[PDB]
Amino acid sequence: GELISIIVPVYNVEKYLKRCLDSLLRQTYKNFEIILINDGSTDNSSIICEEYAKIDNRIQILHQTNAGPSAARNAGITYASGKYITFVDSDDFVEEFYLEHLYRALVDNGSDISVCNFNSFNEDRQSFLFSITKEKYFCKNYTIAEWMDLNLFLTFTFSPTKLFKAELFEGIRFPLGRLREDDATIYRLYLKASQITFINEGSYYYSQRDDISSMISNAEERIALLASMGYDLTEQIKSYKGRLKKCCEDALRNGQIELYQQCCNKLDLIENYPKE
Amino acid sequence: GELISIIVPVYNVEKYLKRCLDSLLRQTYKNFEIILINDGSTDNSSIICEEYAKIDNRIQILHQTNAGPSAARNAGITYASGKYITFVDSDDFVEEFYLEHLYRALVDNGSDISVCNFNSFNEDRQSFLFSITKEKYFCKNYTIAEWMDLNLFLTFTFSPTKLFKAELFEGIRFPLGRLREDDATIYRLYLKASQITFINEGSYYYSQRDDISSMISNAEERIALLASMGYDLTEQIKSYKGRLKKCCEDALRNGQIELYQQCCNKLDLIENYPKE
């Protein structure tokens, strides 16, 4: 198979990194590179990275001065030479057939992107939560319009579980210094695609154990773009109202007063002054 | 007539302030207060303010530590006790019948807001440009939907030439530390109104002699709000695409590289990947 680039930002994850890398080296799909971007870790993460690189030549390390998750992923994208690009968080781990299933689903269907689901692992209790069962398995091709019309966490705000043609990344980078960076970026990759293939399997495990401002501005930017391109807004509008409610209260609790002012005003307009 | 609050931010306008204030004290509509917000001027502006306060008791001065145009206007809004609120830039000046015409247009039509046009004065050549002639005069009542469907400078991004019921300002303030603050605020006041009256007279004179980021996020925010409230997006979408073009090139010229990738990417999507 053609080369897949796995981009893995690493920042102070010494407890979890070995589990992650072991689950990647066990992939049944062999032709990958793993790009570990150590974002200036101050625990043993950087050492663990070096140790794994010494026993598998598919692992490439980039050490860099701490600059945040966006900067780490953008470095991953710049360094990747694969035909495909996928993201794995160093907190998490995957089934041994993860990559292969994503690959087949993309190539056999002629899609530009393939997406699977995830299950969770509760670290506090050391137990899986299998929300996605075999009985609920399905696979499906989508147009972009069908894809954009929906969880919203899996789809828009979570960068892993997805396999991207590398050419999609022309002009697309994660926004610097900001959290909710996936939220701002992943959907722009969808808008580049012609067809997206989804597989409802939980092959990625999300280990389980805020940036209000970005939450709001990401939603506004996404709505403006979709509108300018002629996509339907119904769901994005509901999402936006929901985020405004959360912001209006949480900004106040955090003492983010100008943000509070803004969000309340916006929520006041939508609810009490709609068009007549 | 009921009290009109005229909010006038003052920052280092010693050359122009006397002209502005003289044109205001000559108003045929007498029942106003002028709130001068000296935003920590370092020329003779603050002294000129004090001199005028001594000969007309309708003038109230607020001195404050320099905090920007938004902070100055927000201070004006907080201190205003009028039933109506209007803005005058200290750079500019008005006809003697300016306030009266705005007042009548609002009250006689039962509107929540009245708006007039402006002409310009070229300071370098000391000459008027009468774009708005008497032969092109008209007056008209508008719904918000009719109003929102258009210059765009006069309407959305320019805070003077408009008379607002004071009640409209519940929850509405100019955004701190940002330029294009008018761009972000004025239209939110329109959305509070039931009916807007426009008078096509150039009774305000704009004296004639950048914030790329805000330009873009203001447009995205406005589109998201309007969409959420059910208004039409056609013109805003055209406005947005135009600002992206300007941003894509100007951000690059200024060395604003992350902003440049963002705007190019957005413009690339809109023009080369519209919905299929």
Numbering used by the authors:
A (entry chain A), B (entry chain B): 4 to 153, 160 to 218, 229 to 295
Which sentences from the paper describe this structure?
The x-ray crystal structure of CgT (286–582 amino acids) was determined at 2.4-Å resolution. The space group of the CgT structure is R3, shown in dimer in symmetry unit. Each CgT monomer has a triangle shape and contains three regions: an N-terminal domain, a core region, and a helix domain. The N-terminal region consists of β1-β2-β3-β4 and α1-α2-α3. β1, β2, and β3 make a parallel β-sheet surrounded by α1, α2, and α3 to form a Rossmann-fold. The core region consists of six strands (β5 to β10) and six helixes (α4 to α9). β7, β8, β9, and β10 lined in the center clamped by α5, α6, and α7 form a sandwich shape. At the very C terminus there is a unique helix domain consisting of three helices. In the CgT structure, two monomers bind tail to tail together through the helix domain. Because all key binding residues of this CgT dimer were located in the helix domain, we designate it as a helical binding domain. CgT contains a unique helix binding domain in addition to possessing a typical GT-A-type glycosyltransferase domain. Noticeably, this helix arm is not crucial for GlmU activities. This is in sharp contrast to the helix domain of CgT, which is important for enzymatic activity of CgT in addition to its role in the oligomerization of dGT1.
Glycosylation catalyzed by a series of glycosyltransferases is crucial for biogenesis of SRRP adhesins in Gram-positive bacteria. dGT1 is a unique bifunctional protein involved in the biosynthesis of an SRRP adhesin Fap1 of S. parasanguinis. It is essential for glycosylation of Fap1 by two distinct glycosyltransferase activities derived from the N-terminal and C-terminal regions, respectively. In this study we demonstrate that the C terminus of dGT1 (CgT) is an independent glycosyltransferase, transferring GlcNAc to the Glc-Glc-GlcNAc-modified Fap1. Thus we conclude that CgT catalyzes the fourth step of Fap1 following the action of Gtf1/Gtf2, Gtf3, and DUF1792.
